[PDB]
């Protein structure tokens, strides 16, 4: 019974991982944070480290509105409970567990907090599974098993300010993380002899 | 229970894909034996996942074998104790009774 | 005055000798420890098309 | 270690002290015993040994011996004074088995209580190969070997084995404990593609023809093994010359002209752009 | 000295470990001068650390500690509680031990 | 002991022989395998090793390798001829513990079957004290140390310890077994007359 249960668990994990890698490899609108213009150029050392920022999220929003992609959720108006703030986020973005502190420390245009916890707008709003907060127009969902490219970044010198690195061919290189957004009606699964389910 | 010594042990069953699953049952998709039974460990890298996927072909046999492992835990008990003493004159001639 | 000592690590009790030894040296609860299944987040988004 | 017991008849005080030491208060030497008993290290303490030594001696004269009615059998009056070095006790022991994948740092920590003063720690390693004996870890190369905490960097398949620590007191008493390391190994992911670094574009641009560029290559899948590289000669050899030694590439531009160099390991290619300015 | 980032890191690790959450969050109440709290785990401290926790500041310089009287309404206050910071509810144990 | 396998396509005969040996009838070498499997000495025999070696090679040409449907997967027609020396098997093993009093003769006997020609026997003894290692018993003083049966006269307290025998093949393969001896000692009866 233990052997069968572990077999099935491995099967489910493998299928989900395959789906995630297929989605990541075929992303259409791709944006590089910082000054980088290629996958290798992304680095954490220099005048301009390639970390996510508020203006980058604003750019992603503007690009998506230019393509007329439908929004996934509606804004939240206030509730009468004290210390409750309104939010104007209309899209859902999936991020790994590694970037969450970076998102929490981020500053807005005026220098205050951009991140808003689920505790403030729990009333008069529906909190999705895995929601940790919302920034700008996006609501952030943390998926435990998000994948990443290890060593795809630029070469790491000794001036490392504290970003994750991996060893590639005897040299240390930075990592790259997805921060994915999926739009409505983008993709469909093919079901062969599946009787109406995605996988049999 | 009594009469069984002074230890309790259990079994912990690690998942198929965990890093602690070390064994010698591996056969890769090409059909040759490999060192690692689990397809990929806790690695979250896209390169590793793409390289080590289980791919089946049109006429396929003996391509992908997997194995499993279990580990054990334990814990024991000890003994404690202490005492005190007194004399009869101390109880009888004390100003305050009920000392004991 | 026989002594239990510690049958684990080889310290036989006096009562048990050459022909005899401790059959039982621990207790087994028979209840195992398992890990639950990982959550799935990208599968529900999929919509199926028959082939 | 052997301990020595001295008994004072007048004050009914029994003194326990090391074999080398002596006392001149007027007590007499009753006997000696091993504080950690060889057969039962933990079942018997000092009090039982002192009582067993005193049971032999006579009540009238502690120097002489007598039978049961004249024995010293009352332990309530007798007081035991401790002067010997406290027994060496291992507070925390290494985990029995440690499992790790290759390329990760591992650390062992041990704590010892009691004993003389200036404790000495010495570590040993035994490989899993057949017929191998414990070998002392070179303290000069690894400074942490002499200290209690042993830190080992970037363990590999050859780092698998059994690690045992030895703690030495001032008097020489020794307690030891052992740990086992298990390393899991994965097959190389195989080469997917090769990239060029300083620089992916234009390499190094220098007007002087004598100046030679330096290029380094790598295979993107982490942990992949890159083979011996082969260079396909630079096309317009008049503008530039290209020669590779090992993995590093050196390109000497004869003339100010843009060129492209392709370096291949026999299966995958990388396209390198060369920009030279007069 | 403990900081906000250490508590964030500890919560991140306990989330990756899939450790269950002890407590649920609290939404607001009608009463004035009452602020919401979203701590889901229980943390025990000694008596000596409490002033250090009370003086703590978050990333942007604001006050981090939230007292019990702010969220006494619309919530259940556990035994010996003194406050709550970030994802943890701070519990004061009189006989907490320390290494010296 | 590594074994080398040769397959003759026309007659469907697989020949198992030593690594150094060769056969000139026209067969080809398919691979090598260990007859006593290191991980599972008693679970796997020669037939399983030969089957696993034959699974890789192609049906048309044993020189080349092929995928599943083109393998040699039928073992009814395949016949295995064994030319290698038989594996060395411990027919009789020493008693784990032998208990006796001082002043009594004690005899250890061991039997070994298989292997090549001579099974040179060597005996070793390890002292019971800490920090002791196995040392060869002086064959010159005790001629029986060379032969399989080892005998001691009037064992004493120093005779207690662990005894191991090593049997060596003409090819160099070895098999061992160990025994433990415990001796009882009593106090002197004291001089009555």
Swiss-Prot record, chain A:
Give its localization. Answer: Virion
GO cellular component terms, alphabetically, are: viral capsid
Domain of life from the UniProt record: Viruses
Keywords linked to the UniProt accession: Capsid protein, Virion
What's its job?
Answer: Assembles, to form an icosahedral capsid with a T=9 symmetry, about 60 nm in diameter, and consisting of 535 capsid proteins.
Q: What is this protein called?
A: Major capsid protein
What's the source species for this entry? Answer: Enterobacteria phage N4
Curated annotation (Swiss-Prot), chain C:
Q: Which domain of life is it from?
A: Viruses
Protein name per its UniProtKB record: Major capsid protein
Location(s) in or outside the cell = Virion
Q: What functional role does this protein have?
A: Assembles, to form an icosahedral capsid with a T=9 symmetry, about 60 nm in diameter, and consisting of 535 capsid proteins.
